[PDB]
Symmetry: C3
Subunit: 271 residues, 3 copies
């Protein structure tokens, strides 16, 4: 399916099943296919699942402009409104945690029943003057420099730390192949702009606007988005939030811990 954003950007999405809606927001630099197992799992169990390809990624158009969290949040708003979704459970992975949080911050939670933040960059990822514990911005500056030389090999190399393959985690060649195939669909511009967006966007104000039941899940072996300064803090800043730590789990735990995640999502939905 597709809808056209306000600025003309065609956005690809899938809308599967029927029942209470669950809307998924993917991480960088992937697309809606990263959710395929959670979607099949939940839609076979009485839920409607929706996942979109973020602008610049997967099967969506690749705009030069609007590659920022306010626009991402507003894209999500358009999708929710054009489908007239109610009592939606928002589920964001990695950078996708930011745009579902920013959606609520900008649009409020009238249409929202719950929020799930998976290995999310929330509430803040890169260093700020009052957040020296964040990742130094020159780390991301170097990522961008490498991406602007050879994004294909960069993402290929990223497979290891992403899935924790370098820490013995076990992920097939097929999954690594699929990851790269998907990432190569994306815009170079969007791929690089997103790094700027997730490195420097502060979602701490957003955390105070979240007034729905929230589940934060994070692996404490996460090499990409450090649990201690993200998920752990998000769970404390969101009132009533529940925290689940997957022991030793990597960033890419929707793959490595698929069954556990499926069951935790179902449990949250049935709470």
């Amino acid at each position: 399916s597709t809808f056209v954003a306000k600025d003309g950007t065609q956005i690809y999405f899938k809308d599967w099943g029927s029942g209470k809606p669950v809307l998924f927001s993917h991480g960088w630099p992937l697309d809606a296919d990263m959710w395929e197992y959670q979607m099949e799992y939940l839609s076979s169990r009485g839920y409607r699942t929706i996942a979109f390809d973020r602008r610049g990624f997967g099967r969506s158009d690749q705009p030069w402009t609007g590659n920022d969290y306010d626009t991402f949040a507003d894209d999500i708003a358009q999708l929710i409104e054009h489908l007239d979704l109610k009592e939606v459970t928002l589920v964001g992975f990695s950078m996708g945690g930011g745009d579902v949080a920013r959606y609520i911050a900008r649009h409020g939670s009238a249409r929202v029943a719950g929020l799930v933040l998976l290995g999310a960059v929330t509430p803040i990822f890169g260093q700020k003057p009052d957040y020296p514990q964040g990742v130094p911005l020159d780390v991301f500056a170097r990522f961008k420099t490498e991406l602007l030389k050879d994004r294909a090999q960069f993402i290929s190399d990223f497979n290891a730390p992403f899935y924790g393959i370098n820490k013995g985690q076990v992920v097939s060649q097929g999954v690594q192949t699929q990851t790269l195939q998907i990432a190569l669909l994306a815009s170079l511009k969007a791929t690089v702009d997103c790094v700027t967006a997730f490195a420097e966007t502060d979602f701490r104000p957003d955390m105070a606007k979240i007034d729905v039941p929230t589940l934060v899940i994070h692996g404490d072996g996460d090499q990409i988005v450090p649990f201690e300064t993200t998920g752990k803090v998000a769970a404390e800043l969101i009132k009533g939030a529940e925290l689940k730590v997957y022991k030793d789990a990597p960033h890419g735990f929707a793959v490595t811990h698929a069954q556990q995640l499926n069951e935790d999502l179902l449990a949250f939905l049935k709470r």
Copy 2:
């Protein structure tokens, strides 16, 4: 090109050349590209060739519902009507033998000039009470469990028995790469539902409704769809049907035996 099915599903297809039409229905889990060489071969020799991506596959939309043979058959009917095809020669490979047969069964053969079944699941694939010779259903249950864990590696591993590489057939890494790239475009849901469909759908009633010239081709080295209980039987059950057996040929013989197939299709069309 695209058309919109009854339920709103957008289906991609290619329509090449001019003259008598030949419509191709691909196997699992591929798309219209698996036919590219047959299409160029025939269309450069004065035929019109048409091939679609089955719903849930390749460049087509990925609906949650309708992943069954009655819907596949009606998708074909809609394409045929959409182009107003007449004297069409229907060519199906593997599971694709099922929807061309079911199309005839449901819509009759007024628009049909001939039928070709290549390594097809017809007339029946999985076991039934009166068909213990069929493939046991727990075989397919197990395929589905593996697909629901890691479809990417499952399909990568499938390359060997599919192409008979483990039995002396020679197939390039490029072809294996292209096969996987195509497979990964598909919906997880369609990929799994199709297994249920070809595992359990009985086309024996369909055979009795086929009243056009018919050619069945099958490899007797086929490790995927056993010649003895499918192609061999389909050729007996369809009145007037011709049978060609490619000795020691694998399931993926449109690759390994491309030139032989091209020539056999041309010979059939010029009968």
Copy 3:
């Protein structure tokens, strides 16, 4: 974005940034993604960059007909008119040098500010009676024969001589993977028809009609499109043209010499 050509062919394109427009025409058998680094480079420096997927390639439709230079040039004219571009700088790589040249020849230069030809097939690639120094047509005949057997492995094998990896150039597996992934998107029919087109089309008449500032860049290590009978000659045939030779550069120098190319394009635009 897309537009629809005269014959119904839907053509994918990207349109990034704002300012004076630079329109990119890709080589065989790639798509607009081959330009992604040049586009980001120039659009972040005040230019508007546009690149299309040639008919039959990338995300464009795959027509059986019209795979020739006159149609390609007319496709470009349609895009320029669609966007109503003025003072456009045309940049063609490899076979893409041909359709921007043929555009000017068929439609004039009223809308054109400048022309860049990179490793281009211009002014003539294959042998003619008065051009025995061109590549013998039997060389292309054998290529087409191999393409019609196994295009996937053909393109895979082509990576080495294309990027000069066999002569000491260094290009990542990631880039080689992306090259093949893009190539596989293309039509088999378009892939083969383009060989016919670039092998036999004479652009020498076109060179005489080029009345805008022109820059020709070519690597003298080019194993694919021989510098001495293409780029070297186009620079002399085009009045006022400038020639830059990248020492020992391969055909795929937009990859191996990316920064150099980026700086040369910027310098040309600011000339």
